From a paper:
The cow antibody repertoire contains a unique subset (~10%) of antibodies possessing ultralong CDRH3s, which can reach lengths between 50 to 70 amino acids. The unique CDRH3 structure can be separated into two microdomains where the antigen-binding disulfide-bound “knob” sits on top of a long b-ribbon “stalk” and can bind to both surface and receded epitopes. Ultimately, we isolated a total of 8 and 11 cross-clade nAbs from cow-485 and cow-488, respectively, all of which had ultralong CDRH3s, suggesting only ultralong antibodies were responsible for cross-clade neutralization detected in sera. BnAbs from cow-485 were named Bess, while bnAbs from cow-488 were named ElsE and assigned numbers based on their order of discovery.
Residue numbers in the entry:
A (entry chain H): 2 to 82, 82A, 82B, 82C, 83 to 115, 121 to 262
B (entry chain L): 2 to 9, 11 to 27, 27A, 27B, 28 to 95, 95A, 95B, 96 to 106, ...
The structure:
């Protein structure tokens, strides 16, 4: 089961955020698709879903700004969130959800059909003096599969692609047999940026740090890798920076210094 | 509209740990609580559904239970990979109206202490030719996750241009942090050296770079 969120990484305040989830491996007439988000430092928050019959349900506190539709042949579900503010900056997840409404009677109480014959009865023997209670509906919810999520930032600031600079190894970054080298990913907006090394061939000993929000309103981060000091003369090291908010990818070769 | 969870829960490796989730008769009392695990850098993962049933791949040490309007997630023996944020959830008044818990951060204690490795990079020639200068102090492989970072220009304290990230865990379960000193090319060239000094527990490590040395 695949769930792929798509849409803008940046939306201006008061505008309408529109996202799409492309699905695979199941039928939208068999599974219900829901939306969940998480704002920075906050808890998971339900948005809404559209079920196998096409019925929509929403978070009551957000219903005035939400709309969810689906296209069964195109296998896509769409979410719209109008009049956005910075409280709507969050990671938005497409999900498959279990939703069921169960109708039942309390302990001991049984339906009129169960008592031997649509209301709940206590004494099935003395049906003449038994009380007729309407059933209490129970509701079942859980998230089945989670998409990877799409980070959305609400801001009036403009998109900016990153500048990538090498953090070159020298005698001052070597620890005998190993050496640290990296890339500085400077001055981009909005988040996020991901960094790989040598097109994903180099994975051991990598750490990409979280970004700083500088006073300029732009983010910067670094990614570092520990390599054998003996390889610095012969092995090539390239950091691959991806900034989807600007449709930018940068590869930067990190050359060791002769110092 | 959230279910009440403790904000922080901690335990040592091997210890029993429980996370509670208190709601009302209109949510948790419905009797179908779910539980979710969020590890930074990973999408959320469903742990429990229907009060007690484990999702696919969830280890047996995770159990869920419910007593009235309060649900509990229990780890019988805490292991290193359980360090994460945990969220309960339940429908309310409708199967399509989900309320998540306020969230619990689980910290697993017991791993060995580790002194930080510090690398200080001077501004690259590419950045200097672009009329900018950033010194990058990278701090890695330490535990516990608290350091203090200070900068020097020559031997004098740096009082401007510094930005430092909060420590966060590497893939080897140790902590790393980064600190940046933004300068003009003039400031960089005019001093004899700059230093990043990192204090962790009872030690300080200072790394120094100089414009004349490269």
């Amino acid at each position: 089961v695949q769930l792929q969120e798509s849409g803008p990484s940046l939306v201006k305040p008061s505008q309408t955020l529109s996202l799409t989830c492309t699905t695979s491996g199941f039928s939208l007439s068999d599974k219900t698709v829901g939306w969940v988000r998480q704002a920075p430092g906050k808890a998971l928050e339900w948005l809404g879903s559209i079920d196998t019959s096409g019925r929509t349900g929403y978070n009551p506190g957000l219903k005035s700004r939400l709309d969810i539709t689906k296209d069964n042949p195109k296998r896509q579900v769409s979410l719209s969130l109008s009049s956005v503010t910075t409280a709507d900056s969050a990671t938005y997840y497409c999900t498959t959800v279990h939703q069921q409404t169960r109708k039942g009677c309390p302990d001991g109480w049984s339906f009129g059909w169960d008592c031997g014959f649509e209301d709940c009865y206590d004494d099935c023997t003395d049906i003449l003096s038994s009380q007729t209670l309407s059933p209490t509906d129970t509701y079942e919810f859980h998230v089945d599969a989670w998409g990877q999520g799409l980070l959305v930032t609400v801001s009036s600031a403009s998109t900016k692609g990153p500048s990538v600079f090498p953090l070159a190894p020298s005698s001052k970054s070597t620890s005998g047999g190993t050496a640290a080298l990296g890339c500085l990913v400077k001055d981009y907006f909005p988040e996020p940026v991901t960094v790989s090394w040598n097109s994903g061939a180099l994975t051991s000993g990598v750490h990409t740090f979280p970004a700083v929000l500088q006073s300029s309103g732009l983010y910067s981060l670094s990614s570092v890798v520990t390599v054998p000091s003996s390889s610095l003369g012969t092995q090539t090291y390239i950091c691959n920076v991806n900034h989807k908010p600007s449709n930018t990818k940068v590869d930067k070769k990190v050359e060791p210094k002769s110092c | 509209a959230v279910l009440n969870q403790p904000s922080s829960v901690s335990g040592s490796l091997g210890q029993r740990v429980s996370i509670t989730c208190s709601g009302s008769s209109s949510n948790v009392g419905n009797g179908y609580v779910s539980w979710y695990q969020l590890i930074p850098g990973s999408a959320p993962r469903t742990l429990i559904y229907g009060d007690t049933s484990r999702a696919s791949g969830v280890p047996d040490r995770f159990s869920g239970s419910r007593s009235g309007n309060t649900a509990t997630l229990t780890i019988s023996s805490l292991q290193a990979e359980d360090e994460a944020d945990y969220f309960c959830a339940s429908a309310e008044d409708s199967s399509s109206n989900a309320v998540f818990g306020s969230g619990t951060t689980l910290t697993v204690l017991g791993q060995p202490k580790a002194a930080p490795s510090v690398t200080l990079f001077p501004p690259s020639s590419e950045e200097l030719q672009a009329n900018k200068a950033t010194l990058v102090c990278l701090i890695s492989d330490f535990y516990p996750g608290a350091v203090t970072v200070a900068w020097k220009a020559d031997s004098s304290p740096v009082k401007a241009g510094v930005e430092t990230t909060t420590p966060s865990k590497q893939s080897n379960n140790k902590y790393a942090a980064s600190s940046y000193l933004s300068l003009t090319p003039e400031q960089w060239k005019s001093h004899r050296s700059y230093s990043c000094q990192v204090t962790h527990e009872g030690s300080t490590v200072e790394k120094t770079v100089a414009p004349t040395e490269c």
